[PDB]
């Protein structure tokens, strides 16, 4: 069911031929999500899942891609009778969206591993009847487009995907599962999750995609991994070129994570004439501030990881502190465990290792060391403050004694003379705390000898010491 203009670039014999197809689609009224995802999946299959016989690039012949396309459009159009679901005024109904969701869901293999690579695309859905969590939501949107439902669009948080539709684009529906061992909410709105102020629903500051942003999603969903050890250079290059295409057309303006992904790719292999990774990381942060009320975590995590890779201790600490300043205004809720795990690794592994190395380089006579900079100590404190404030009001606790040992260790990496230069001011470096835990910890933070037991008592729910 492809239009004649959609077929004139085939066969696709190179990365650039793939890019030309994306450009042509992105120049149309609406880019064809089904065509583009099939093409990406096909190429990824033959560059990452099965490279046997690869010489340059897996040539995508029209007859193959068209046959796949027709399998998909036939499956959807035969299973969804639009006459059962009347459409007033270019608006879909919740029952129709539920129907499309159920058609995709009920098509999947009964039992398979959901965390496998390379099951994100409509190629995977057609050939293997397998999709990952977010891949289901994308497939529901692609099915909707195939049915002429122009109002149905992908919604994205930083760890989940669903659909928006309906009068004014205001209706939400769950269409896929989230995480492992969580209960399904398919068909429901996301309003309880917004109301709960969980990270998973971003307090309502989530991405509402247009069709061009849906193209960006599928590009970000490219997986170059061949195994844990090795990535496909061709798929990295394709992803990078497609991200620049979208960038230049304006389609990454409202997509912070995509700008961070692009930055990472640029660090690996810089494109002549293009912005530096740091510029792109800062663009991602600016997008979150501009469009999403500065309620996103990963723009700052992308930046912090860049600084941490480059052994920039000051700027790494600053960026994690900024991360924590975002999280502090959330409630930690049951399906937010991915961001918990990220903060836990930063506090209890990443920062300890950075400061350990800094302590060695300080012994070796580094000048300008983070460990002699009071502003760096302040960033460490602001990081913990944000985590403590996050916990306030939450249905799930965050902190425990396992966190306390690393806090005491990290505080200890700064000399008392450095720590004393931070002034902790109430509402040199000046710091205001937002959390009641850190407010109570203020006086302990400048002793020459850090009082480990006192700190542990202040950070945790523990209020007594051993009886004997």
């Amino acid at each position: 069911g492809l239009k004649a203009a959609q077929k004139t670039l085939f066969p696709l014999r190179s990365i650039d031929d793939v890019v030309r197809l994306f450009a042509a689609e992105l120049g149309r009224e609406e880019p064809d999500l089904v065509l583009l995802s099939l093409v990406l999946g096909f190429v990824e299959h033959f560059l990452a899942v099965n490279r046997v016989g690869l010489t340059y690039f897996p040539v995508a012949d029209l007859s193959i891609i068209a046959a796949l396309y027709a399998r998909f459009t036939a499956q959807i159009r035969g299973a969804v009778d639009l006459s059962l679901y009347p459409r007033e005024g270019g608006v879909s109904s919740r029952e129709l969206v539920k129907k499309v969701s159920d058609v995709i869901w009920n098509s999947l293999s009964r039992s398979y591993f959901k965390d496998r690579a390379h099951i994100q695309s409509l190629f995977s859905f057609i050939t293997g009847t397998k999709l990952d969590s977010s891949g289901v939501a994308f497939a529901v949107v692609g099915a909707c487009q195939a049915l002429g439902l122009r109002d149905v669009h992908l919604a994205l948080s930083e760890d989940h995907a669903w659909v928006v539709f309906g009068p004014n684009g205001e209706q939400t529906a769950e269409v896929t599962w989230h995480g492992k061992g969580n209960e399904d909410r398919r068909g429901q709105t996301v309003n309880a999750g917004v109301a709960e102020r969980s990270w998973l629903y971003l307090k309502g500051s989530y991405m509402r995609c247009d069709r061009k942003m849906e193209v960006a999603f599928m590009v970000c969903a490219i997986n170059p991994s061949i195994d844990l050890h090795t990535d496909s250079l061709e798929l990295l290059q394709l992803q990078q070129k497609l991200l620049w295409l979208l960038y230049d057309l304006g389609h990454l303006e409202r997509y912070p994570m995509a700008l961070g992904n692009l930055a990472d790719l640029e660090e690996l292999e810089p494109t002549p004439g293009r912005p530096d990774p740091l510029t792109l990381y800062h663009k991602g942060i600016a997008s979150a501030k501009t469009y999403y009320r500065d309620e996103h975590i990963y723009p700052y995590m992308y930046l912090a990881r860049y600084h941490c890779r480059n052994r920039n201790v000051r700027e790494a600490l600053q960026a994690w502190a900024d991360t924590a300043t975002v999280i502090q205004d959330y409630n930690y809720c049951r399906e937010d465990e991915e961001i918990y795990k990220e903060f836990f690794e930063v506090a209890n592994d990443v920062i300890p290792n950075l400061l350990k190395e800094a302590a060695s380089l300080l012994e070796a006579g580094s000048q300008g060391s983070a460990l002699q900079d009071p502003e760096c100590f302040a960033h460490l404190l602001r990081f913990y403050d944000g985590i403590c404030k996050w916990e306030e009001g939450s249905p799930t606790p965050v902190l425990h004694v396992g966190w306390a040992t690393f806090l005491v260790q990290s505080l200890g990496r700064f000399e008392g003379q450095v720590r004393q230069k931070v002034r902790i001011v109430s509402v040199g470096p000046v710091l205001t705390f937002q959390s009641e835990k850190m407010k109570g910890m203020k006086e302990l933070l400048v002793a020459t000898k850090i009082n480990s037991s006192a700190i542990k008592l202040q950070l945790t729910a523990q209020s007594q010491v051993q009886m004997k």
Partner: peptide, 12 residues
Amino acid sequence: SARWRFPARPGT
């Protein structure tokens, strides 16, 4: 073996 990750999540 390679693993899924949420699209454009940072890190490895």
